[PDB]
Amino acid sequence: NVKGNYVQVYVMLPLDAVSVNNRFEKGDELRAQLRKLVEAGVDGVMVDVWWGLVEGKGPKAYDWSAYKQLFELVQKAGLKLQAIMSFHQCGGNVGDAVNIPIPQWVRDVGTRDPDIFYTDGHGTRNIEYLTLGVDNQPLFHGRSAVQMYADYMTSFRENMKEFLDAGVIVDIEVGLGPAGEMRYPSYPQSHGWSFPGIGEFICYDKYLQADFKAAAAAVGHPEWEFPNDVGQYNDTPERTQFFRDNGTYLSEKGRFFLAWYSNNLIKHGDRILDEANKVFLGYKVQLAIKISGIHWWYKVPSHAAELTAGYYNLHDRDGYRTIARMLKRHRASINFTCAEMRDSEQSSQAMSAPEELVQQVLSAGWREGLNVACENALPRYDPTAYNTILRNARPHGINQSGPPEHKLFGFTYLRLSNQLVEGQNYANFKTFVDRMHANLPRDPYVDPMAPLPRSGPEISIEMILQAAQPKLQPFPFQEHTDLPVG
Numbered sequence: 001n002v003k004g005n006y007v008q009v010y011v012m013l014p015l016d017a018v019s020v021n022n023r024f025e026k027g028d029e030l031r032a033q034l035r036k037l038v039e040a041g042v043d044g045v046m047v048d049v050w051w052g053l054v055e056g057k058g059p060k061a062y063d064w065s066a067y068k069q070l071f072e073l074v075q076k077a078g079l080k081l082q083a084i085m086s087f088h089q090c091g092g093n094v095g096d097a098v099n100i101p102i103p104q105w106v107r108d109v110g111t112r113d114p115d116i117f118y119t120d121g122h123g124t125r126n127i128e129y130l131t132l133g134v135d136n137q138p139l140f141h142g143r144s145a146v147q148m149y150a151d152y153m154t155s156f157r158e159n160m161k162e163f164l165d166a167g168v169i170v171d172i173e174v175g176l177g178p179a180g181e182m183r184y185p186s187y188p189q190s191h192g193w194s195f196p197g198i199g200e201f202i203c204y205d206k207y208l209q210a211d212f213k214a215a216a217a218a219v220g221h222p223e224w225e226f227p228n229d230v231g232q233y234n235d236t237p238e239r240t241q242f243f244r245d246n247g248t249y250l251s252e253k254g255r256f257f258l259a260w261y262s263n264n265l266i267k268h269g270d271r272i273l274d275e276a277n278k279v280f281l282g283y284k285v286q287l288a289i290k291i292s293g294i295h296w297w298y299k300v301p302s303h304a305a306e307l308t309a310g311y312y313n314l315h316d317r318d319g320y321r322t323i324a325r326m327l328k329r330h331r332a333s334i335n336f337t338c339a340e341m342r343d344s345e346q347s348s349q350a351m352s353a354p355e356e357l358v359q360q361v362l363s364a365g366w367r368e369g370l371n372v373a374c375e376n377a378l379p380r381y382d383p384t385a386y387n388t389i390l391r392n393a394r395p396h397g398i399n400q401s402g403p404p405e406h407k408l409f410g411f412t413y414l415r416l417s418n419q420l421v422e423g424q425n426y427a428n429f430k431t432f433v434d435r436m437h438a439n440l441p442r443d444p445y446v447d448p449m450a451p452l453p454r455s456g457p458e459i460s461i462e463m464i465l466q467a468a469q470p471k472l473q474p475f476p477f478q479e480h481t482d483l484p485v486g
């Protein structure tokens with residue numbers, strides 16, 4: 001009896017599932033594509049629910065018409081649905097086809113207060129998301145950013161109640177930064193960064209500067225400032241005194257700054273998840289966050305790119321198990337990425353270890369008792385990619401007589417297109433879904449959700465940080481799946 005081995009597979013819809021004009025205009029094409037996904041046994045789909053589309057008119061002027069039409073189509077296809085609360089810009093990089101900013105009336109606040117945006121040491125404003133520094137600042141016609149997020153989720157719940165009650169919507173992923181990820185915009189690809197640069201610390205908005213000054217004063221160092229030996233976006237670690245081997249990241253001041261920077265991200269997630277949990281209390285849904293997969297520089301001591309993204313991860317400090325501990329009271333899950341990547345596929349100069357990073361994040365989640373899901377980072381259609389995902393989905397392989405010791409709660413494939421559902425690409429994908437399901441048919445009843453309970457007691461940052469050390473080895477992962485595509 002191998003049923004406990006089944007891993008659900010979701011497919012991300014196109015970024016244009018709803019048009020840039022907040023109209024549902026590609027229903028027939030989507031219906032035809034969904035027939036191919038149903039033919040393949042897919043459990044469900046996932047979609048960005050764009051803040052800039054729905055609350056684009058003005059404050060509280062929510063227009064759910066297009067999303068309700070999409071959700072009805074998905075329901076009528078017999079598929080489940082994962083919904084992302086997408087509080088960020090879609091696109092805006094060179095060559096991006098689908099471009100959806102956050103609401104214009106929100107951005108208008110930035111004309112008199114440009115510090116609503118994450119800002120780098122050059123002064124450059126990132127306009128994709130509101131700084132965590134304004135989470136609780138009532139700058140937006142009397143509302144704070146957290147209040148806008150809570151109010152959007154409340155309207156979503158009210159409008160989409162029928163889909164919740166029908167068991168269509170099964171997961172709410174709460175966007176927490178650029179690209180919906182709980183991170184800083186430290187690698188701005190169309191604006192001065194190229195892979196595999198170390199990135200930069202994006203903490204120069206006036207709200208975050210004042211927060212650092214207060215934190216530094218509370219520990220008797222009012223004179224401390226952000227590190228000034230950190231180089232720039234496209235440096236490598238040895239170009240800098242901060243990130244080099246034996247560099248100033250190790251110093252008392254460096255540790256204080258890196259803790260402050262990464263803790264603020266953790267506090268940002270905790271406060272927004274608390275509000276999301278209040279909204280969805282009693283509904284049979286999973287709440288999730290998305291952690292970005294910063295695999296470059298993972299092999300060097302400073303983990304420089306993780307540091308600048310906000311993940312304070314070192315040989316002897318688990319910067320993901322802290323995040324996981326924060327999620328525990330919410331019963332929130334981690335949605336990770338890079339599940340398709342092998343280390344051998346990465347360039348040598350990137351000092352990149354996606355396999356080890358995946359193992360670390362999955363192991364951290366599992367040690368805190370969380371559900372963990374994953375995505376692929378980059379487009380892949382080939383058997384090797386599917387077999388790498390399969391390894392990560394069941395790291396110990398098939399248990400012949402019950403549930404395995406560890407397994408992903410789900411996998412979401414990025415992303416549906418016409419190219420996926422034809423030819424050899426489609427053949428490879430269908431076989432992948434079979435293998436993820438342990439060669440069983442689709443189970444519409446799998447992984448039922450209890451009504452969401454209220455978050456447990458708020459725990460302090462000090463309590464969260466107990467998870468950082470000692471750093472533990474990951475659980476053992478097989479080198480290759482025992483159930484390959486063939």
Ligand SMILES: C[C@H]1O[C@H](O[C@H]2[C@H](O)[C@@H](O)[C@@H](O[C@H]3[C@H](O)[C@@H](O)[C@H](O)O[C@@H]3CO)O[C@@H]2CO)[C@H](O)[C@@H](O)[C@@H]1N[C@H]1C=C(CO)[C@@H](O)[C@H](O)[C@H]1O
Binds near residue numbers: 292377
């Ligand atoms: C930002 C991004 O940087 C790196 O990705 C590289 C690829 O390694 C490189 O091969 C090339 O990718 C192209 C790909 O090969 C091709 O098949 C596809 O059709 O087009 C791709 C784009 O040109 O270029 C990219 C970009 O330099 C890393 O290897 C990626 O892991 C990395 N992704 C980031 C970004 C985000 C968004 O916040 C996270 O979701 C993700 O986890 C993170 O790793």
